C-alpha cells in the first residue's frame, strides 16, 4: 500500500519536531490555584489553569482535617484510604474537549502503574543514613480515636502528556479563546465515612464511630507543569503536530450482572487504543484477595483467550510491572508494549469468571488509552 509510506513519513517529521521542543524549551511548574473550604457547604470546584505553552500535566495537593466526634468508638482507615479524597477529576481542552474523566482511586493506580512503584511513597531500606518517611508527602493516620483529629495529605498527578520524554497527549494552550478547565469533586461528609457492614469503596475511614465523623477543612492546591519558550521559526511555531492531535485519556465505569461460574465480558471500544486496564471486583461491599474469582482473561472476537490466568498468576504479571501488589480486589492488566486497538484485530473483550457473587456486586473498570482522528 502506497498510503503507509506517507503516514510513516509524517511520523518521522513529527518525531523530529518532538525532540526539538523537548530539547530547546523550558519546563515550568507553577501554582495556578489554591483554596481552603468546608465540605458541608460545597465540594465541587472548578480550576482555571494558565493558558501558556504546551501543558503536560497537573499536580494536585489535597489536605484534610477529619475529626471523630463519637463518644467511645474509633474509626480505621480503609484499603483505598486517602486516595478517595478527590471523588472525580474532569479535564477539558482549550477547545472544550474532554480528555480525562476518571475517579480518584483510579487516578492513583495509574500513577502507581506509570512509575513502577506506589506513587510518591518512600521504600523501606536498610540504610543507616536517615532516609525514608521524613516529609510525609502522602500521609494519613491509621486510626482516629473518639475525640481525636487526623491530618491527611494526598497528591495526584493528572496527566496530559504520556511521559516526560514522550509528548503524546499533550495540550497546546496558546489559543486565543481558550476554554481550558479542570473540574474537581471532593469527599463530603456522606461519602468518606462508612459504617461497619457498608461498602468502603469510595470511603476513607470506616468503623463503629463513623456516624459522628466529619471534616473540619479540605484545602487543595493545583500546580501546572508546562513547557515555556517554544521554538519559533519563519513559518511559525515548531510543534509535534500529530502528538498534540492525539489525546491521552483516563476513564472509569461500573458494570453489573455477575453470575457464579459464568464469564462476564466487557467489550473494548473500537475507536480507542487501550494501554492499561484496571478491574475492581466489588463483591457487595466485600473485597477478597483472589478467592472469589476463577480466572481473568482478555478474550478476542472468535473465542480465543490471550491471557487466561488464575488470580495468583494474574498478580504475578503485575509484580514485574509495579514491584508490589495492588489492594485486595484490584486487578491490573498491562498492554503498553502492544496496545489493544480492537480495530485492526477484531473485537477484544475483558473477561472475569467469578466464583462467588453477593447481592449488589459490581465490577468497576478503569481504562487508559490513546485517541486521535487517523
Amino acid at each position: 500500500q502506497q498510503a503507509a509510506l506517507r503516514n510513516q513519513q509524517a511520523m518521522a517529521a513529527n518525531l523530529q519536531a518532538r525532540q526539538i521542543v523537548l530539547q530547546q524549551s523550558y519546563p515550568v511548574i507553577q501554582q495556578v490555584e489554591t483554596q481552603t473550604f468546608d465540605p458541608a457547604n460545597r465540594s465541587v470546584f472548578d480550576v482555571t489553569p494558565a493558558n501558556v505553552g504546551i501543558v503536560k500535566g497537573f499536580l494536585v495537593k489535597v489536605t484534610a482535617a477529619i475529626k471523630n466526634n463519637h463518644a467511645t468508638e474509633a474509626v480505621a482507615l480503609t484499603d483505598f484510604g486517602p486516595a478517595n479524597l478527590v471523588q472525580r477529576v474532569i479535564y477539558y481542552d482549550p477547545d472544550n474537549q474532554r480528555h480525562t474523566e476518571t475517579s480518584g482511586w483510579h487516578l492513583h493506580f495509574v500513577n502507581t502503574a506509570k512509575q513502577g512503584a506506589p506513587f510518591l511513597s518512600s521504600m523501606v531500606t536498610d540504610s543507616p543514613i536517615k532516609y525514608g518517611d521524613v516529609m510525609n508527602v502522602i500521609d494519613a493516620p491509621a486510626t482516629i480515636a473518639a475525640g481525636a483529629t487526623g491530618e491527611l495529605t494526598m497528591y495526584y498527578w493528572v496527566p496530559l502528556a504520556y511521559s516526560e520524554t514522550d509528548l503524546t497527549g499533550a495540550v497546546l494552550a496558546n489559543v486565543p479563546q481558550s476554554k481550558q478547565r479542570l473540574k474537581l469533586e471532593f469527599a463530603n461528609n456522606n461519602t468518606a465515612f462508612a459504617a461497619v457492614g457498608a461498602n468502603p469503596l469510595e470511603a476513607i475511614y470506616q468503623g463503629a464511630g463513623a456516624a459522628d465523623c466529619e471534616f473540619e477543612e479540605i484545602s487543595y492546591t493545583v500546580y501546572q507543569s508546562y513547557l515555556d519558550q517554544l521554538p519559533v521559526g519563519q513559518n511559525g511555531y515548531i510543534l509535534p503536530l500529530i502528538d498534540l492531535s492525539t489525546l491521552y485519556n483516563l476513564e472509569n465505569s461500573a458494570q453489573a450482572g455477575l453470575t457464579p461460574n459464568v464469564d462476564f465480558v466487557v467489550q473494548y471500544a473500537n475507536l480507542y487504543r487501550y494501554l492499561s486496564t484496571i478491574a475492581v471486583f466489588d463483591n457487595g461491599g466485600s473485597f477478597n484477595a483472589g478467592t472469589d474469582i476463577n480466572y481473568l482473561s482478555q478474550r478476542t472476537a472468535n473465542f480465543s483467550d490471550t491471557r487466561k490466568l488464575d488470580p495468583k498468576t494474574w498478580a504475578a504479571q503485575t509484580r514485574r510491572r509495579i514491584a508490589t501488589d495492588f489492594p485486595k480486589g484490584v486487578y491490573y492488566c498491562d498492554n503498553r508494549d502492544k496496545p489493544i486497538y480492537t480495530l485492526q484485530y477484531g473485537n477484544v473483550g475483558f473477561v472475569v469468571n467469578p466464583k462467588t457473587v453477593n447481592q449488589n456486586a459490581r465490577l468497576l473498570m478503569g481504562y487508559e488509552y490513546f485517541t486521535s482522528r487517523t
Binding site: Q1, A3, A4, N7, L343, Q344, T374
Partner: protein, 51 residues
C-alpha cells in the same frame, strides 16, 4: 519464475491481512464498482492457483 498475484503459499496467506492494514476494505465496495469487483475476484483466484 515470478507471478504477479502470488502472495505466498495459499493455505497460509488466504486469511492474512496485508502489511499496514488498519482496517480492510471490501473488494467491490450497479450501486458500486462492477468490473473492479470482477477483476478483484479474478486476481484472488489467480493467487490461489499460481498463474
Amino acid at each position: 519464475q515470478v507471478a504477479s498475484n502470488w502472495e505466498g503459499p495459499p493455505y497460509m496467506t488466504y486469511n492474512q491481512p496485508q502489511a499496514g492494514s488498519v482496517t480492510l476494505p471490501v473488494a467491490g465496495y450497479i450501486s458500486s464498482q462492477l468490473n473492479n469487483y470482477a477483476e478483484s475476484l479474478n486476481d484472488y483466484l489467480a493467487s490461489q492457483a499460481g498463474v
